[PDB]
Design an enzyme around this catalytic site. Structure first.
Site, PDB file in Angstrom:
ATOM      1  CG  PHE A   1      21.791 -29.013  21.088  1.00 12.63           C
ATOM      2  CD1 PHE A   1      21.607 -28.680  22.399  1.00 12.63           C
ATOM      3  CD2 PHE A   1      21.909 -30.379  20.748  1.00 12.63           C
ATOM      4  CE1 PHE A   1      21.463 -29.627  23.377  1.00 12.63           C
ATOM      5  CE2 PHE A   1      21.823 -31.316  21.740  1.00 12.63           C
ATOM      6  CZ  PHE A   1      21.578 -30.952  23.039  1.00 12.63           C
TER       7      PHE A   1
ATOM      8  CG  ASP B   1      12.951 -32.554  25.789  1.00 17.11           C
ATOM      9  OD1 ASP B   1      13.939 -32.031  26.355  1.00 17.11           O
ATOM     10  OD2 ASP B   1      11.740 -32.361  26.189  1.00 17.11           O
TER      11      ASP B   1
ATOM     12  CE1 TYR C   1      18.263 -24.960  23.218  1.00 15.86           C
ATOM     13  CE2 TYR C   1      17.926 -25.008  20.752  1.00 15.86           C
ATOM     14  CZ  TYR C   1      18.783 -24.978  21.893  1.00 15.86           C
ATOM     15  OH  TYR C   1      20.153 -24.881  21.762  1.00 15.86           O
TER      16      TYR C   1
ATOM     17  CG  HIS D   1      22.058 -31.821  28.125  1.00 17.40           C
ATOM     18  ND1 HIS D   1      21.775 -30.475  28.026  1.00 17.40           N
ATOM     19  CD2 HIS D   1      21.344 -32.429  27.165  1.00 17.40           C
ATOM     20  CE1 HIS D   1      20.892 -30.293  27.067  1.00 17.40           C
ATOM     21  NE2 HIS D   1      20.616 -31.460  26.531  1.00 17.40           N
TER      22      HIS D   1
HETATM   23  O1  LIG Z   1      17.546 -29.684  20.804  1.00 20.18           O
HETATM   24  C1  LIG Z   1      17.768 -29.592  22.036  1.00 20.18           C
HETATM   25  C2  LIG Z   1      17.679 -28.398  22.743  1.00 20.18           C
HETATM   26  C3  LIG Z   1      17.872 -28.391  24.087  1.00 20.18           C
HETATM   27  N1  LIG Z   1      18.186 -29.556  24.729  1.00 20.18           N
HETATM   28  C4  LIG Z   1      18.309 -30.721  24.056  1.00 20.18           C
HETATM   29  O2  LIG Z   1      18.602 -31.771  24.700  1.00 20.18           O
HETATM   30  N2  LIG Z   1      18.148 -30.689  22.700  1.00 20.18           N
HETATM   31 CL   LIG Z   2      18.832 -24.643  26.836  1.00 22.59          CL
END
Ligand SMILES: O=c1cc[nH]c(=O)[nH]1
Ligand SMILES: [Cl-]
Length: 224
Positions: free
Chosen positions: A78, A65, A67, A188
């Site tokens: 990201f 999800d 930030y 992750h």
């Molecule tokens: O877009 C993002 C940012 C942080 N962590 C996630 O899993 N996705």
């Molecule tokens: Cl992060």
């Protein structure tokens, strides 16, 4: 409003089956605002990943999800705006694995738009979040939308590598059970998961090898 007004035409056609569900998410988000529950990213960026062509996707990156800090999420998983510093912790870890894997210099900034322009879909399983409250929109209806997106990409039967970062990898592998599709998983890149297997995973070069195996062109991963 029709999906064609929010996303690229290939994606609007791909997401047809869930157009009602997108509209429903629209209504959910409006009610969140009316209740004083802001969300991130900005409305106009929620569907940003789907504004680059569906037909051109060769690699799908799937996070969890967005930030949760205001000023970070931009609707490409990201990524951050070019003037953001420090980089968020997931992105700094991504970038260290990037340099270790590819040997390219550290990127000049956190903007992943070049990847999006080159056929990388920067997806999250859930497309919104409340400030400072990770996973707060989990189970609110995005999962059906992102499932449709993943399955529609797979259904093209064009070479496709999915890079699955974090807890939803298992759930997601079956969505990619199709010809010309390969899913690779790792932990992750977030602060406390990255050192449990994200580092050392070499996803960029691996995706490229898998693409070339299938007769596709590799992604030029190099960021300015
Ligand atoms: O877009 C993002 C940012 C942080 N962590 C996630 O899993 N996705
Ligand atoms: Cl992060």
């Amino acid at each position: 409003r029709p999906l064609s007004e929010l996303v690229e035409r290939g994606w609007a056609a791909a997401l047809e089956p869930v157009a009602d569900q997108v509209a429903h998410m629209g209504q959910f988000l409006r009610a969140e605002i009316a209740a004083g529950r802001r969300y991130l990213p900005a409305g106009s960026n929620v569907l940003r990943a789907f504004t680059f062509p569906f037909d051109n996707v060769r690699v799908l990156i799937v996070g969890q999800d967005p930030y949760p800090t205001p000023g970070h999420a931009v609707g490409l998983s990201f990524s951050v705006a070019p003037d953001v510093r420090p980089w968020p912790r997931s992105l700094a870890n991504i970038f260290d694995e990037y340099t270790a894997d590819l040997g390219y210099p550290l990127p000049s900034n956190g903007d992943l738009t070049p990847w999006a322009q080159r056929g990388v879909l920067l997806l999250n399983r859930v497309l919104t979040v409340r400030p400072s409250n990770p996973a707060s929109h989990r189970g609110k209806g995005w999962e059906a939308v992102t499932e449709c997106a993943i399955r529609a990409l797979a259904a093209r039967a064009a070479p496709l590598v999915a890079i699955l970062w974090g807890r939803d990898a298992s759930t997601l592998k079956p969505m990619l059970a199709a010809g010309n599709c390969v899913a690779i998983e790792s932990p992750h890149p977030s602060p406390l998961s990255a050192s449990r297997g994200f580092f050392g995973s070499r996803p960029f070069s691996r995706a490229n090898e898998l693409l070339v195996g299938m007769g596709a062109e590799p992604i030029d991963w190099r960021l300015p």
